[PDB]
Symmetry: C4
Subunit: 334 residues, 4 copies
Amino acid sequence: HESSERVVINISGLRFETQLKTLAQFPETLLGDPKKRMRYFDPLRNEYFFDRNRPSFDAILYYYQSGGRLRRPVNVPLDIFSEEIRFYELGEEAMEMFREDEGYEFQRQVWLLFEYPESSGPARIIAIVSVMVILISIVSFCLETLPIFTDPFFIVETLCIIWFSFEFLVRFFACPSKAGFFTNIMNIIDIVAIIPYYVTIVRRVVQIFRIMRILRIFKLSRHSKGLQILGQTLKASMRELGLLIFFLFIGVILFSSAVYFAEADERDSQFPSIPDAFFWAVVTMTTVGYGDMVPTTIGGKIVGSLCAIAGVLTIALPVPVIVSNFNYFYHRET
Amino acid sequence: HESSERVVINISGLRFETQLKTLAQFPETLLGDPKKRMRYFDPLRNEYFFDRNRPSFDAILYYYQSGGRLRRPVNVPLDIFSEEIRFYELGEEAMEMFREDEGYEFQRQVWLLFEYPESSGPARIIAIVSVMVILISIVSFCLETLPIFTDPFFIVETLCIIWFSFEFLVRFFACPSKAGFFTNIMNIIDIVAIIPYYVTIVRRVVQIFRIMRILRIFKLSRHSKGLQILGQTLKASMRELGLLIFFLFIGVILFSSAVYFAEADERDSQFPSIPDAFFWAVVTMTTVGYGDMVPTTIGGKIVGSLCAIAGVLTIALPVPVIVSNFNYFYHRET
Amino acid sequence: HESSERVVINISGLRFETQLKTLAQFPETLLGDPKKRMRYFDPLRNEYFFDRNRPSFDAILYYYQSGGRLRRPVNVPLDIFSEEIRFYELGEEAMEMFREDEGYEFQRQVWLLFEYPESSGPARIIAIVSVMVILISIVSFCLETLPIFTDPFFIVETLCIIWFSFEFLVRFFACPSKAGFFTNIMNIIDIVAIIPYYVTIVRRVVQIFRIMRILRIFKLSRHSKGLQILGQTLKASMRELGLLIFFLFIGVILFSSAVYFAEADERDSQFPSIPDAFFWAVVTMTTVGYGDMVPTTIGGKIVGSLCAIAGVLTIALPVPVIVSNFNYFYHRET
Amino acid sequence: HESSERVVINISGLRFETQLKTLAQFPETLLGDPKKRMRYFDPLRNEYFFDRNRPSFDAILYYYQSGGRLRRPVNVPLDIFSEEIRFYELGEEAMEMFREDEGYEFQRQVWLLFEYPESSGPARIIAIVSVMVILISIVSFCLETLPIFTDPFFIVETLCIIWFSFEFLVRFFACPSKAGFFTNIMNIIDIVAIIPYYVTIVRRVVQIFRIMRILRIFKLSRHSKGLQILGQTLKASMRELGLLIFFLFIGVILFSSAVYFAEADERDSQFPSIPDAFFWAVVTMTTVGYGDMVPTTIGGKIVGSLCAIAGVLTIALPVPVIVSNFNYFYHRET
Ligand SMILES: [K+]
Ligand SMILES: [K+]
Ligand SMILES: [K+]
Ligand SMILES: [K+]
Ligand SMILES: [K+]
Ligand SMILES: [K+]
């Protein structure tokens, strides 16, 4: 009991040696409780024997020596080291920190088919129809603006919205906490996909509410794991995502002004002002190269060359970070 | 014999210590059979001595302690650790699991030249002619549609098909299991490369059977290891491959609608409907930028800028996974 | 005292053994000073006991054996090994080398708000206005060249420069070493952003001083960490950065000459000389593909194909080095 | 002497134990020669003591046990393990294998200035003029074809060739082995840069010898390390380099035929034949997108979309291998 008396721990032939005050620091563990560890004592050698994994005990003993630092060694498998922590009984408060450091009736029945579709057969069949109603609604939306086009795009627009409403209503009543119902951004999409039609019953407003009829494409996120992974990626990459927008903003203003002063004293110049040369810089840095406007002078072609070179660089800098973020959520979701 | 009696195993000076019940778990092995291991016993120290590799034995002893877990340590070479498993005689059922976890007359003679061309000299010379008959058949197919063009493209089309038939026939008779003949997708290609001509002896059909005269290019897979590696890559990447198609599908419908509502109240607008703006989104996200259609309004250029930015991102996310899959099959095929 | 007498050091059960002349090499350390280490001596075993980390001591003892080589083992955490060096008292001259090898009143008050804006609340509020004066100055600069345009772009140009001057003046007087004031390239930008206007109070000069009114965009580097990281990246990548320019220079002259001699005997040729075909090679290698000029002959299309293939290769060679350099400064700045 | 007698080797407290027949296998080494190792024997413990590196000896002892396998451990530094091999005296034949497995008067004076320019000051000054004569020769070559142009491009063409000849002549006489003079591909370039002019003192020949006046750009490889690294990269990447050309060849014929049969029954079709649609596939897969020809039909735009998608994939597969090959030669040349 905190007395500098020395204790020898033998792990499958690997000899460990520490003070009793070090093990008495955590009395709830195996080596810390004199009653739990005595089952492993060897009175012929004055040591405790364990017929278990050897590379793991380095961190187990150091967990006592450091006072709580539980770090898996770089050569010990994750499943093996985690099973050793449960044997020596380090505790759930210590096991949780190891996982954090490692990176880790009638109402309930109708709630399963309209939320967890893998719960049963008929629960997943509804997910098929809930997808067909999205694809048909997307198809009908694009075929409205066709130059060719009772009103045959109102039978479908209203048949695609009786599902969008009847399905949204059940999820609002079969839900437990109505106050935490709006935290899930996946149901605000279900609302923004019913706001336009139900409010259509100043020209700027009728146009924008027609735009909000394009967010329905996000309703596929409920039935697509890939869109979910994409959402978590951008949400965790806002720094390098906005960093790309900022590096473009500097490159646009820089190279739009550079091509303007090199293509300003020309009758055949296509750069009348700096803002007009903005789109040229964006399509040149992104290597899109529409061809709707291209420099003609010597200095204009020099700026155009450096605009394409600096474009592929300033874009490829924050891309691998976003790609690595995506591969994390994608490989983890298995 | 399962009796808690302790056993000391000395590996080139590294001392290991376990119970006899642990080694008696696998009596067919070296340390498990009392007759096999006694040749290594030292009665002066009461231990078994082995003058072999030291870093490997950590996993060898743990294979007994865990009950079958055979995992090579991260610092032991693959060839060295595999040669240790054969010494201690863990077994073929255990060696196979280690390889799985590590990622690993007259009829027969004519079958070698027309299947395994590296079997001999004349067997590989036929592979040269079997390639020249593919290149000439591909050349003749493209020169048919030339605006310039008994019928001189029937002498070659039929001379290139007497090989395609005579060679396909021998592979059908010199083959053992005729029932498993169609499992190899490499011979269905040999059939789809004879279906059109032999069936040409409703306008929609004559056109499509003319298309099926383009799958002959896949007959090069028999003589090209690179095409084989490409086939295994796509076959193992269907998830991220289709995930790219889906992320494009969302980006197309999203940005085609965005540019349409920004380029709809314009006499000089080139976006009459959403479907017409589909191709613009694909060539902009892929940075192809044909220039056949480009926005003119302010909001149209804003959507065009974000369409090129979101294009290089949503494409570069599943690409490294496909590239890594390709490097696996390519480096392994050595 | 340099006498070959042997010393046994026991680290938590791991036995180490060395000569006394090896530890007496560094008398200022723990194991080197007989008075410091005697507190850990065990007269029953004739050894020094330490109840500390075991994987770290390999390098600690080798620091004595090699004569100063202090290299952290590949399996020991950086924070753990650094805390061991301070226990054994290797010294600050040795700790500094370990960090290098690891990769690591009234005047003062007004100097905080105009240099270290995170010092207080009002110090950071000025950084907001110091950014708004940059954005408005950039906006006003681009709206000058608009084809539409007492003089309303002089009220803003002079209101944006009273801040650019009043703020630059305080940083010159609240600065300690006026001689080392110009070493910081971030203040030469503050000067080049006041040189044009204050000197406007040979046509080639009035034009270039109008260009120098575009370097103001760099004044955002004071309030943007991302621009700072970009500056350090290019400054540390000048080799592979200029290596890209050189590989392009070879590819331009190579493929411009190749397309010229293939598109010289043509009435409809768009390549009258080698220099005119320079811009075509740059936009083709960078995959920009404006379309302002494209080959027509067979050999011209062959050169164009190889120009696009060799373009994506010669560009993607020095890019990952620049990307890796960027990820270093970006992840380190946390 | 091959007698199973056991030998204990103590490395700084780490105990090793082997048979004498194992060490007697290599009598020329330290532990193998009884006269060399006796200087380290301890008659009080019957063991050989060494006050040296501990992680290295695992492979040193296994070099005897395996019979010649000398593999550095994954945790031992390269410089430390190499210095241990020289202490135990394993031999030069064994040290060379370790390096291979690790990846590793008047005539002589004039030969230094014209081959090894870093030998002295005046030797490197000539390299500056030898570069200026290349840049001027390249500049003069491109300014010949200018539409504006005793003959002022013969004074420079001949002044740039008196250096190209006088410098080539000295390297041929100040060279030792004239038979191995043509093995260095860097001097065949010096010959192909003198072949045209000296042979100009059938129209197809005068044109091609005018082309061979473009290989002079390769004379910069003598004064540019980057071009040397690029040469070694392509020379070691011919597999994945030609693999890219082959994957393009399949994609060209595949997608050129696909767009043709979808754009053949159209008065406004721009694809009259398969070969004419070749260039469209190359510029679409490489995302160049000139815009000189673009599909119009529905199926043509479908093929165009898949041609751009399959383009960025089939190109990005063998690129990282070429990039990794380049980073090897580039980082090694330091
Ligand atoms: K392009
Ligand atoms: K274009
Ligand atoms: K591009
Ligand atoms: K383009
Ligand atoms: K165009
Ligand atoms: K055009």
